[PDB]
Design a protein around this ligand. Sequence first.
Ligand code: PLM
Ligand code: PLM
Lengths: 57, 57, 268, 268, 59, 59, 256, 256
Amino acid sequence: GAQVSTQKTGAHIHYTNINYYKDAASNSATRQDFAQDPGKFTEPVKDIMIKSLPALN
Amino acid sequence: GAQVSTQKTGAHIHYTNINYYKDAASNSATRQDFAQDPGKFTEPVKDIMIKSLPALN
Amino acid sequence: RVADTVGTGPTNSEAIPALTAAETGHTSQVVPGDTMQTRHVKNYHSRSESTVENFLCRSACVYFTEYKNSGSKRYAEWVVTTRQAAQLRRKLEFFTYIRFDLELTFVITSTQQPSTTQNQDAQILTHQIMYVPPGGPVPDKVDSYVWQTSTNPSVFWTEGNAPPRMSIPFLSIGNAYSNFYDGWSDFSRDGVYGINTLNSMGTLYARHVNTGGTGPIKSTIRIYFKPKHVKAWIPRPPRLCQYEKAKNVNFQPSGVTTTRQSITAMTN
Amino acid sequence: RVADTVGTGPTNSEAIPALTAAETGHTSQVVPGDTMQTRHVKNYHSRSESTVENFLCRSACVYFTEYKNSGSKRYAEWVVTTRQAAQLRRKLEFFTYIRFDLELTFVITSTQQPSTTQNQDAQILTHQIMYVPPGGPVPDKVDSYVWQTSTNPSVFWTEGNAPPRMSIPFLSIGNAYSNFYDGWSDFSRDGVYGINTLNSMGTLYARHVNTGGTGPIKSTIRIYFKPKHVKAWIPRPPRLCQYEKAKNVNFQPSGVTTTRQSITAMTN
Amino acid sequence: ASDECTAGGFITCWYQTNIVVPADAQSSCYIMCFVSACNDFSVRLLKDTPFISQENFFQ
Amino acid sequence: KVNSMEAYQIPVRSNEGSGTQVFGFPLQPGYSSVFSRTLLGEILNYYTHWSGSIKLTFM
Amino acid sequence: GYSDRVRSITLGNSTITTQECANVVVGYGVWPDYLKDNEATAEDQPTQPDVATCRFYTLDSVQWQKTSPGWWWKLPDALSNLGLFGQNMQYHYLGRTGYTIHVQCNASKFHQGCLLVVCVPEAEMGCATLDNTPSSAELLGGDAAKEFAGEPIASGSNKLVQRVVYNAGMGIGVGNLTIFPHQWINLRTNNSATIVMPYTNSVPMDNMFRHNNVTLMVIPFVPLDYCPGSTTYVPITVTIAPMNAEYNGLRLAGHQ
Amino acid sequence: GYSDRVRSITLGNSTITTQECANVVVGYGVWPDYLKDNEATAEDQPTQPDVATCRFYTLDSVQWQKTSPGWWWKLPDALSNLGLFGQNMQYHYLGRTGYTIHVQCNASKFHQGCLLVVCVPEAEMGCATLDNTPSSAELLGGDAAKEFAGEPIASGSNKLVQRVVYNAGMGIGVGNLTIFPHQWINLRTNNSATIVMPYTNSVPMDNMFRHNNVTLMVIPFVPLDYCPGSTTYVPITVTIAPMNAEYNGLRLAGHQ
Ligand SMILES: CCCCCCCCCCCCCCCC(=O)O
Ligand SMILES: CCCCCCCCCCCCCCCC(=O)O
């Protein structure tokens, strides 16, 4: 059961990976996980604030 | 995802290549890129000149 | 992929993007275009090296110890702790809670030690590393039954080839590893206080399997840690201080920053 | 594939292929057939070794340095520069702008150094190479914290097997590497002038991980560079001069060519 | 790391107008400054940090 | 001032003439002493290259 | 119409009403909630005292002086002897709860001062002596505020928390406390600060007496200062309300 | 919601933000605009420096005293040596441009004063001596404010502008300056005044150095006055931004 994935390349090409162990802890790291969400740390406050309105009214 | 390409042979035969890395910078060199265009360096001038016409008229 | 700026044109308006309140604690989020006229620029830049996994997916040497083929100190024992190396400790400290698989590489180098004995002949040394879980009997001498390792994971290495490598599953009684614990070992609150209270990862023992030659040989074993499959939560500020012990966060007091000659001056 | 000549027959005509103007600067492009009668010949010749990638896809030794297991000079440091080797420098100079991935092979050879000490025993030496980005702390001594390499790429090699090999992604602040820069480091224009201004590729450090024997050992590390995925623009004439420094293009003045006895003579 | 080739810029503050206060209000006040990465901000070539160093392994 | 909480505070006062300069600091976050120890600066000390806009907030 | 500044919070039989407030902050964007069955390690049914435990509790006020380094409270210790909530934890081996924090300071328009109200998970204070861990009495104050010291603790060979303000006791820069959820009280713009905290911990439930989850800290970045004849005493009051409090492991009272 | 008083104007790389302002005034209800082809006398293409010329420029501030007759600026002269805009006019024979005027004064609630900010097309000042026209140095101040005099210029036989405040130098009543576009700054009600001017002139384009189109004048109808111990220095700052500036007649630099 071979898996085909994209490679890390520049902008302005696939690598085959096969698991040979069943421990699942013997796999490679998940380097390609480019997801971010600053909503927790920034804009923590309950009532939402618009970009251009008086902050306190 | 194996890729099959032609080999370098004489005139007057395929090699299999598989990428085992995702960095994409770990791939082999692109030796077989036989494209040339002297138009930049030779015949630089704007107005095109025919092979057998007086050069200046 | 990084967000790309939007082109803007001059306007006079009731709306006030630049004006905001610090007191709310909602960080202001204003683009360059709101403050000044800008031009449409596309960005191909990628936030692909800031990922927590990329930042923490590199081998670092947590600790090294020395043992002798002859003399009183036959074998070396090290308790398994992340804190004793500053670089590994500082990056782990960046998150309060971390969950991660561990990759271990051991590098062993043997140096001949000068001696009065002569015409020494040296057969290739073989080195045994054995890891004991809490409550496993400790070896008391190098020739002990504990060295059989029937119930204990163990690796044998012959000098002159690739360093031995193993993968470790996430081991914790807890759902996540705790970089900082604000707690006492007992209910009374009289006793040791600190992260050392949640510290029970076991101990590692290294010995010469065999002695090649009469002369004394000293072997150094270096242990390397590489986080894998990393998961983080509750981020913490940068430590900003030199470390003092691996059992506590006690610190000599430190100035906030290096000092420039004057508020106006651009020179550090 | 090379262009193949077309057969031609005698003719008298107004048209003048051989006649042309040098002043326009458009290189004349006339086949042999226009100047003389020719025969139809097919060419199987291929322009497949003139490609820039084939020309620059071969390992060359940019530089080598020596470090000692004992004595004051424990480790060797080399700043990473293409210019210090003439053959590598000359071919790179052929294009003003070049973009290319870098392949690095390190070959390490250790030679025993004669000494007064006797009955030496030598365990296999292990060698560590560590690359530091600009502003990474430099090691001041061989036993420094800098040698942990938690944030720094590093390779460990055991003597007696294939040389260590790594691939490097195209590293530049700029879109392309600049072989020549006509510029000053500062706005004033008083200061160092040259390509050295755009030179910030970091530094490489090599040390003995361990000492096998009491006697002195000297190790030479040789660094080899192989361009990959090459892309070139703005081609430059052949250098035509012996080099003098790696920081400037300063040259002793050179005659145009070797001299024959007379314009008529066919002997060099 | 500071580079001769690339100089980031100079940031400075000036009084557009004199500060004005009523009698019984303090003439002198204070201003705090907060610094952050924008949405377009990015980084590369991760390296060991200069500030953290150990003479010996800690105990 | 670094030893006290006065490091963060920037002094301002009513003055006879308008146009006096409140303060001046280097633009780069990583090398400058003023931004080296901040959240963004500390993360930057870890990485060799940096890109994009910086937001400065004054209360 | 309505005002963003005006607010009214009602928990149990206690209601809080401030004419002026900065927008309320939820620290990680998560409301406190009761534990899931899927995530629950303990088999025994939990006991939920509901409104009894979940009410505002007012602590002893402190005096803001022109030279006060700082004031800090260990929150679990703060409510350890207050009402049914103090009684339930003493009775039960395991407790998990959300916490509502409300810090109120009142001053005249002429007054000028800025206080930083930050709640920090797992803050570990470090002892002034390197070879000794900090004492429990120094670490936690029951019924009384514990105060930061502007100067570093002097050289000593005894248990003693290191209280220097810039390190904040954690040996970390005071300015970077922004990453922890926080709310700024500026006398010209804000009357009081409200922070709501989701329960945070690696384990789903933990014994409250042995372990403290979060620590409320107040530090003045800008000193209080006023012209002569103005009120010279300023009072800061901390009110804390438990949220969705639940208890397990019914046991005989007291800790040892 | 929004406030009528709050405003934010962004021109080029300069942004102006005032918490309190009187409604902005367009003097004849006409926005400044580039010249029409139908109306254009000159055949040669014009050069439009765009954002370079069109940015706010800040002038030297003045001190409002309890007895200041008045301050007045010739606007074309004011920006004659400032940035690219000063350079373009020196290079070019003909220039036509719109002008944005922003006058900012800050005072404590206790302070009381009223300033009249009026822009007047073709103001011609009259010399104190009847037989002599006014001198250029007296008529226009470059990089510096020119000040009205409460008393009439004394008897003289020399060039000298007549500066008496009631005549305003035009020999016309000060009160009737209302017909010219204007905005009142009252310390209790207004922080600053914004006036936007359409280009005004008989000819479509005119040489800037020889001829000045409009003159900004500030006069206090009500004197500044305050109780003792209040800030005794008040600063008035004039910021001017060119609008839709265009240039023609590329010529060697300087005027003669
Ligand atoms: C068989 C030889 C190797 C034995 C390895 C034993 C398992 C070691 C696991 C260490 C994990 C450290 C996690 C971070 C620090 C901590 O939470 O204690
Ligand atoms: C981990 C050990 C290897 C470290 C390699 C570091 C990267 C070296 C890159 C050198 C590129 C040279 C490019 C041509 C010359 C120049 O433009 O400066």
